Design a protein around this ligand. Structure first.
Ligand code: S3P
Ligand code: GPJ
Length: 427
């Protein structure tokens, strides 16, 4: 078992040029592969989730080149649905942004492809997406547990009236939205009830429009899609810096700054996680917005009680920042933390208690009362990049912290610790 120990950080200050957005990167790669023409993506993220999408495209026969640092990608579009037969197996790690979108896209036309991944991915739900794709004509078989990968996709999605449950993941709707335009018949996607992680649907529609397709959004309750469309290369496309990766650095300044500026995202960004800065401001930090940066300067840090359904990923960063805040913090409406890289409500509560906090693990919320002083702990990371990144913030105190399996940050941010060290100051 590998581990890294972080020494106490006296102050943070500086500038970080963010790695690319995982959410934007994987949508842009799949749409570029489906499109007609050559797309050049710049500021693409090099991380495990993106590498699994790149490997899947390679296996499906898509041609592309990558720059030395893997952040520039020139993709030759396929000019239509991707195909493979012989139950070709695509291994997708634990990347939901590859698994869910490919599960839908590869239902176009005929195919015989198996999608699988790491053990945890075989425990992450996908039944709501499979149910919707089958209503549209797709033939899909669960090869192991019903409602979970691995899946054998045999094609057949033609369109029509499709209901989809949006209560567990917005990714099922995202996957349907990206796929339906290329189906032969028009599709009407009806949301059954609640829709979680709503801002990610806006990212999907933004990327689809960049690739030449628009649909009719009826107040996020129903989406009307015309079939028989084609995606078209946008030419050169700049992937935004990752706003979820930014959260650690902005929070570090709110706790121990100094001023920390992150570049690559700004006031015009499409990612919902830029709203994480609004939470730091509500807690007492100062935020500055630019066209291509967001900065945070230390002010004070008071506890908050907020529904975080709009920023589920960056919300984990508030759970460890809460260790430094005055009062009890409560993060609500975050049930799907349970069905992601690990059950995050259980993991976050367990590790927070190890450093001294009193924590109530609610069914779909977490309440955190900080200790007077933190103690040393060896933090388990649950094969979850964000558990490693969130607990790195414990070192902005008088105590070191040991993080187990630090390389798990590679799911979205391989260079995380070197970047945190870049803004760590001794004086
Ligand atoms: O569509 C996307 O890019 C994502 C949507 C979210 O998942 P849910 O919709 O399941 O919350 C988020 O947690 C994930 O990291 C990225
Ligand atoms: O990045 C995160 O915090 C959660 N990702 C879930 P996935 O992208 O694998 O569906």
């Amino acid at each position: 078992m590998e581990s890294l120990t972080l020494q106490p950080i006296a102050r943070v200050d500086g500038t970080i040029n963010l790695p690319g957005s995982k959410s934007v990167s994987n949508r842009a790669l799949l749409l570029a592969a489906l499109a007609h023409g050559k797309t050049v993506l710049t500021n693409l993220l090099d991380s495990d989730d993106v590498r699994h999408m790149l490997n899947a495209l390679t296996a499906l026969g898509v041609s592309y080149t990558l720059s030395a640092d893997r952040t520039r990608c020139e993709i030759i579009g396929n000019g239509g649905p991707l195909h493979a037969e012989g139950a070709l197996e695509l291994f997708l790690g634990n990347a939901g942004t590859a698994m869910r979108p490919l599960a839908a896209a590869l239902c176009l036309g005929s195919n015989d492809i198996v999608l699988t991944g790491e053990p945890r991915m075989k425990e992450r739900p996908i039944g709501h997406l499979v149910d919707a794709l089958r209503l549209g004509g797709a033939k899909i078989t669960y090869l192991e547990q019903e409602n979970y990968p691995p899946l054998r996709l045999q094609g057949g999605f033609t369109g029509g009236n499709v209901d989809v449950d949006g209560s567990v993941s917005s990714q099922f709707l995202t996957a349907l939205l990206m796929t339906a335009p290329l189906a032969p018949e028009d599709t009407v996607i009806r949301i059954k009830g609640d829709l979680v992680s709503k801002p990610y649907i806006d990212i999907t529609l933004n990327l689809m429009k960049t690739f030449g397709v628009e649909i009719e959004n009826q107040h996020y309750q129903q989406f009307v899609v015309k079939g028989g469309q084609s995606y078209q290369s946008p030419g050169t496309y700049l992937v935004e810096g990752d706003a979820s990766s930014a959260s650690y650095f902005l929070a570090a300044a709110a706790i121990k700054g100094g001023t920390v500026k992150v570049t690559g995202i700004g006031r015009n960004s499409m990612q919902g996680d830029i709203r994480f800065a609004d939470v730091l401001e509500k807690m007492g930090a100062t935020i500055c917005w630019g066209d291509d940066y967001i900065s945070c300067t230390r002010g004070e840090l008071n506890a908050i009680d907020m529904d975080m359904n709009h920023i589920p990923d960056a919300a984990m960063t508030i759970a460890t920042a809460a260790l430094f805040a005055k009062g009890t913090t409560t993060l609500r409406n975050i049930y799907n933390w349970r069905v992601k890289e690990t059950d995050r409500l259980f993991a976050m509560a367990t590790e927070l208690r190890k450093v001294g906090a009193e924590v109530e693990e609610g069914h779909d919320y977490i309440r955190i009362t900080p200790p007077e002083k933190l103690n040393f702990a060896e933090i388990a990371t649950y094969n979850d990049h964000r558990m490693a990144m969130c607990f790195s913030l414990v070192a902005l105190s008088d105590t070191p912290v040991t993080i187990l399996d630090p390389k798990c940050t590679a799911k979205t941010f391989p260079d995380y610790f070197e970047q945190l060290a870049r803004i760590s100051q001794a004086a």
